[PDB]
Design a protein around this nucleic acid. Structure first.
Ligand SMILES: [K+]
Ligand SMILES: [K+]
Ligand SMILES: [K+]
Ligand SMILES: [K+]
Ligand SMILES: [K+]
Ligand code: NI
Ligand code: NI
Ligand code: NI
Ligand code: NI
Lengths: 131, 131, 131, 131
DNA sequence: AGTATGACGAATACTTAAAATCGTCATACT
DNA sequence: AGTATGACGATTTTAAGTATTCGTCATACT
């Protein structure tokens, strides 16, 4: 098999290990392998063509890599694809934005990842509602 | 923080890396992490004790007398969970409502149900975001 | 850009400078500007062909079965002037709605009126932001 | 009397002068004096006591003065007076934000100023709805 | 009185350089 | 297989410094 080195926040790591231990896992590699495999398999994306509405929601640290200042530009670039976005400051560092999108379910998907992917933007998620 | 090495079958890794490039993160580490945090969260939102946030999105028509009226009511019902609610008038008689909620994941789920029910609520979807 | 000097009575200036420090701007120039744009943009809305954005806010009781799903219907009549509408649930029966509107300042003021009307809408206010 | 030099955008200055001319004003200093005096005198501050809800709404170039990330930062500083904020991208450069505030009408008022005073935040406006 | 401008400390925008983190591999001990 | 690290380029943070653009007061013209 292949080796791979990932880098995790201390908290993430603990949260992960313990939870892997309470499940009967004696080795991380298995543990993680099962999750990747699982969540990876149960996947699906948006067919390019249909139009409609989408609801992109996600959390992120506004401090990390001028994410706040950046996320906006990211959107203003396709400002003809954003209806509005609702923000909710959940604490000094973290933020929970919810963006309503409208247009080519394709462009949407893009713009979505143009966000979600960013390092320091956890729990990304795009929900679609095509005409 | 922390850095770890795991081992996964040549097969899986390929599947993972496809995702890395295919959908955004040209970073294997993040890809994993985001999939790791998905995991922890699921098996945290469906765990006794957890509190947090949540994004309940749904559609419905403003043409039914016993549809648009109830929603708001049954929502004020537990107005201690509703942070706010963005609403869009997609077309002439259809509404796209997104409601951000906050509290014990339990009640929250409950609260979501008592909303997706009210006949006329289509595509109802809950997205939990623990602490 | 442009820089100008004006002359005002010792009296007035003192009143202005109190405002500068008292309420934010520790900058005389801005203080003035903001007050100047209030003036202009005011006698800019009450005019012809004037188009732009507007923020219609108001409160009401959802308890009244003819007030809850009553506002949404009116808004759906001008679903072409509505962008989105944020809504909060102050308490068991109080609603705080904010409707962001775009279009011609006429139809808007119109629209607003209709919504300010529907008996039971208190504190109703509309702010215009011409282009 | 006292001399004072303010700095204005070219457009602002023209918009202002012409409008001052169409009103029978032969000198700017009078024109401006009258507006300052008026709107200034016609104020309405908030006392540190009454709690309630507020509706702060403004526009601002997100690239100017790092506003996008600063605004956020400041709000996260008073992240307890903030319920939720609705953003709307009107164009590549400008943004229309609507923050719904809650708490001691006095702090709100303060906070609101910590947003409106900013060079780069035009048409700022606070609307109060106490208890 | 009402308008323009010079002059210059203060605030903000651009560049540029060094320091601290992250993302992957590869080697090495369990 | 699993897990832990050194090594090292790519990505971000900080710090630093210079060119601009502001905000006001002072001086001078209209
Ligand atoms: K991410
Ligand atoms: K609430
Ligand atoms: K609409
Ligand atoms: K908050
Ligand atoms: K301002
Ligand atoms: Ni925030
Ligand atoms: Ni609607
Ligand atoms: Ni309500
Ligand atoms: Ni914007």
């Amino acid at each position: 098999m292949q080796r791979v080195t990932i880098t995790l926040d201390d908290d993430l790591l603990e949260t992960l290990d313990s939870l892997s231990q309470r499940r009967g896992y004696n080795n991380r590699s298995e543990a993680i392998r099962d999750i990747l495999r699982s969540a990876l398999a149960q996947e699906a994306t948006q067919q390019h063509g249909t139009q409609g509405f989408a609801v992109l929601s996600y959390v992120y640290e506004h401090e990390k890599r001028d994410l706040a200042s950046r996320i906006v530009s990211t959107q203003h670039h396709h400002h003809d694809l954003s209806v509005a976005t609702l923000h909710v400051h959940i604490n000094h560092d973290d933020c929970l934005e919810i963006a309503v999108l409208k247009g080519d379910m394709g462009d949407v998907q893009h713009f979505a990842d143009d966000v979600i992917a960013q390092r320091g933007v956890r729990h990304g998620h795009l929900q679609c509602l095509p005409k």
